[PDB]
Amino acid sequence: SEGVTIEFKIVGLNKKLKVFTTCPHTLFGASFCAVAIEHPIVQDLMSKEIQDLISSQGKNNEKVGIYTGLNVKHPFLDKELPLYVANFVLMEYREGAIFGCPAHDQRDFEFAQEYDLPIIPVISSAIEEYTNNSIMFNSEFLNGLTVSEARKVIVEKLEEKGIGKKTI
Ligand SMILES: [C]N([C][C][C]OC1=C2C(=C(Br)[C]=[C]1)[C]([C][N])O[B@]21O[C]2[C]([C]OP([O])([O])=O)O[C](N3[C]=NC4=C([N])N=[C]N=C43)[C]2O1)[C]C1=[C][C]=[C][C]=[C]1
């Protein structure tokens, strides 16, 4: 609709992953990264046998994915996030790649529950016509800020480091 594009460093390689989000302020609650089945990164960084795993389609309506074997470095935390090929990510929409926040997104929770991924809460429950007064927590420099202030500060920090930009 109107979001931000974020670059993630792929661990042990000189390659990057661009993801699109409409909730950049929930970045400290990221558990995984997921790309579409038809994403270029599948043909570039993975074996041809990945198509055999993909066709095994079996669990429809259920959020399923395959761990690629690669991790991405979190931009602000000393930690890595696993990278998946997921059935619920659409290639034709934006970058065909997402970051997952299971504590505040139903689709991300269903995926994390299946693959035992961590659940990290970041919003404590209370464009310019209204202000969302829910407060950020577990989010380093975003702590204590309302959701509205946090959306602004995270974008300034991503732009300041050359790893994020506004995307219409
Ligand atoms: C879940 N819904 C959206 C609802 C709003 O998205 C939410 C998003 C977060 C949170 Br926290 C809460 C809601 C965070 C963490 N996941 O990021 B979020 O913002 C993006 C958000 C942007 O979509 P929109 O419609 O709001 O403009 O959808 C996710 N996304 C992006 N590209 C994607 C892609 N190719 N295939 C799938 N999903 C993608 C991203 O998920 C996904 C959805 C289902 C089908 C087509 C397109 C989007």
Numbering used by the authors: 221 to 276, 280 to 349, 353, 378 to 418
Describing publication, verbatim:
Here, we report the discovery of potent boron-based compounds that inhibit an unprecedented target of Wolbachia, leucyl-tRNA synthetase (LeuRS), and demonstrate that inhibition of this microbiota target is an efficient approach to arrest the growth of its host. The editing site of LeuRS plays a key role to maintain fidelity in protein translation by hydrolyzing tRNALeu mischarged to noncognate amino acids such as norvaline. Altogether, these experiments show that benzoxaborole inhibitors of Wolbachia LeuRS are prodrugs that, in an enzyme-independent manner, form adducts with adenosine substrates. The adducts then bind with potent nanomolar affinity into the Wolbachia LeuRS editing site and efficiently compete with the physiological substrate norvaline.
In the absence of AMP, Cmpd6 and Cmpd9 did not bind to Wolbachia LeuRS; however, in the presence of AMP, the compounds were potent LeuRS inhibitors, with dissociation constants of 44 and 6 nM, respectively. Cmpd9 has stronger affinity than Cmpd6, which arises from a more favorable binding entropy, likely due to a more optimal conformation by the alkyl-phenyl group of Cmpd9 to bind into the Wolbachia LeuRS drug pocket. The potent nanomolar affinities of the two compounds are explained by a combination of multiple polar and hydrophobic interactions established by the inhibition adducts in the editing site. Both compounds make equivalent interactions with Wolbachia LeuRS, except for minor differences in the 2-amido-thiazole and amino-methyl phenyl groups of Cmpd6 and Cmpd9, respectively. Specifically, the amino-methyl phenyl of Cmpd9 packs between residues F311, L313, and Y316, and makes several hydrophobic contacts, and at the same time, the phenyl group makes two favorable aromatic π-π interactions, one parallel-displaced with the adenosine ring and one T-shape stacking with Y316. This conformation is further stabilized by hydrogen bonds of the adenosine-phosphate to residues Y316 and S221. Other key interactions, shared by the two compounds, are a hydrogen bond by the oxaborole oxygen-1 to T241; and the three hydrogen bonds established by the 3-aminomethyl to F322, D328, and D331. In the adduct formed with AMP, the phenyl and amido-thiazole groups stack against the adenosine base and enable multiple interactions within the Wolbachia LeuRS drug pocket. Conversely, the B factors of the adduct AMP-Cmpd9 are invariably low for all atoms, including the phenyl group.
